């Protein structure tokens, strides 16, 4: 029983450590994609506005 309990705690250790690492790895790429999307949105909006102004 005591061997099993200790092994369970070790397994939970490793699983949760891997979970946090994967979460951070996902976070960095999500932030990168977010920044690219924001830049694209603002540049397209500005181009649309300036073209609409020049069209007159």
């Amino acid at each position: 029983l005591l061997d099993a309990k200790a092994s369970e705690h070790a397994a939970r250790m490793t699983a949760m450590k891997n979970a946090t690492d994967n979460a951070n790895e996902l976070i960095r790429t999500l932030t990168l994609s977010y920044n690219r999307a924001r830049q694209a949105a603002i540049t397209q909006e500005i181009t649309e506005i300036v073209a609409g102004a020049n069209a007159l």
Partner: protein, 478 residues
């Protein structure tokens, strides 16, 4: 040669183009044929782009346009106290006209960098959370940013009312607010008795765009008079975002080239020119001061927008309000995690300085462990102690509306909480405990209150501990 007269060419949307007016100056005041006022913005080679300052439905092409020769100016004086005035200087509340005998241009240079002195006096707002964590000193321009329905106007009204005893003169500038809200605000201020030392400047959403564009400048120009007379002034704007919207609309109508989010090129120049006139004058100038508390509203907490970004870069610090916390019930729901005040530290009295730091570290420690509260498997000696302390501190930091708390009682309760004396009271009775403690201090703590008032320093720790022990003994747990 037409020199002081001109004829209208185009009309529409509050924008008029006139022909002539060759001797007009940019930013001058122009009177139409039927009595509507107007300011000239653009001076082209043959036409003068005029902006109309009223109901423009009565102007037909071919109207006569006259000259006044006066740069834009607002009435100012001591008679304005306790009145509601539109930016042009006229009363909108009846009660007869005003008796202002002196006027000053709305556009004046800011005080120079050699006439300013480091801020060193406190501005007592009466809100425990901000007064303890993100202090405001006279002469500082601090920004209060929050989403809709987050008690922004509530905080503004409390900090306006709390100045009743001090020497401050407060000015409230309403931009784009509903006339109903403005009327209710005026009524509650009158009921609290603050109208004997305050001025309200209103620009409702129904008014034309130039009035919205001019309201903040009118307020600041009104304040600068009491600046240079030597008093202390506090001014509050509600909607710098709405003022920016009005200016953008005016520039777009006048066919000026657009920039980011269709905003004209000089929106940052406009905001900086408005806000930089708030400073703490040196002793050579008389010792006046003017602190500004602009409000900015963000949709779903998007502080990444152009106007919030610019105002953040301009001002001296942010006070964040949380929609989720306000919905949960926390009042005033100050997000102390993100709020910052660069002036702080030197803006607090010594009595509050000696106690603020420990509470700040306690909140910082508790904030990161809020997810631990779902399970009792927590390590009790450290983590559960932190959870209990954080819950008690938050419950203390809650507050009701329109009841400012004097600084002595604030520091008293903060000291009592910090020194661990409240670890025994159940977390669901701390508010009643606080009210009863204020009552007991009013009963027999007058000596400590007087000492704190007259020295800005903590009282004798032994006597303070004895008094709080006596109150703890006489308290009953529910």
């Amino acid at each position: 040669q037409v020199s002081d007269v001109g004829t209208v060419i185009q009309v529409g949307d509050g924008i008029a183009r006139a022909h002539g007016l060759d001797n007009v100056m940019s930013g001058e005041l122009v009177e139409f044929a039927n009595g509507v006022m107007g300011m000239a913005l653009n001076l082209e080679e043959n036409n003068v782009g005029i902006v109309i300052l009223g109901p423009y439905t009565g102007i037909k092409e071919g109207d006569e346009v006259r000259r006044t020769g006066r740069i834009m100016e607002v009435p100012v004086g001591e008679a304005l106290i306790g009145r509601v005035v539109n930016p042009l200087g006229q009363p909108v509340d009846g009660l007869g006209p005003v008796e202002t005998t002196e006027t000053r241009p709305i556009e004046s240079p800011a005080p120079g960098v050699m006439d300013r002195r480091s801020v060193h006096e406190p501005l007592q707002t009466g809100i425990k959370a901000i007064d303890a964590l993100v202090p405001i000193g006279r002469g500082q321009r601090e920004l209060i940013i929050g989403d809709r329905q987050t008690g922004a106007a509530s905080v503004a009204i409390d900090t306006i009312i709390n100045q009743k005893d001090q020497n401050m003169i407060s000015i409230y500038v309403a931009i784009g607010q509903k006339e109903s809200t403005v009327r209710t605000v005026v009524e509650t201020l009158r009921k609290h008795g603050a109208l004997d030392y305050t001025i309200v400047v209103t620009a409702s959403a129904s008014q034309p765009a130039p009035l919205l564009f001019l309201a903040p400048y009118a307020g600041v120009a009104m304040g600068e008079y009491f600046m240079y007379k030597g008093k202390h002034v506090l001014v509050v704007y509600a909607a710098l975002s709405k003022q920016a919207a009005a200016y953008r609309e005016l520039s777009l109508l006048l066919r000026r080239p657009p920039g980011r989010e269709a905003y004209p090129g000089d929106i940052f120049y406009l905001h900086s020119r408005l806000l930089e006139r708030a400073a703490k004058l040196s002793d050579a100038k008389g010792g006046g001061s003017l602190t500004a508390l602009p409000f900015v509203e963000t949709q779903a907490g998007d502080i990444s927008a152009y106007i919030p970004t610019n105002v953040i870069s301009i001002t001296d610090g942010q006070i964040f309000l949380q929609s989720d916390l306000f919905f949960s019930g926390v009042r005033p729901a100050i997000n102390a995690g993100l709020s910052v005040s660069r002036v702080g530290g030197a803006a607090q009295i010594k009595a509050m300085k000696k106690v603020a730091g420990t509470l700040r570290l306690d909140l910082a420690a508790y904030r990161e462990l809020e997810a631990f509260a779902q399970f009792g498997s927590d390590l009790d000696k450290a983590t559960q102690a932190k959870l209990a302390r954080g819950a008690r501190t938050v419950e203390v930091l809650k507050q009701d509306l329109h009841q400012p708390i004097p600084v002595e009682k604030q520091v008293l309760i903060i000291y009592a909480l910090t020194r661990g004396f409240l670890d025994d009271i159940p977390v669901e009775d701390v508010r009643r405990f606080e009210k009863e403690f204020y009552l007991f201090l009013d009963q027999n703590g007058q000596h400590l209150l007087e000492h704190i008032r007259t020295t800005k320093d903590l009282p004798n720790e032994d006597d303070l501990n004895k008094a709080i022990e006596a109150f703890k003994k006489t308290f009953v747990v529910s």
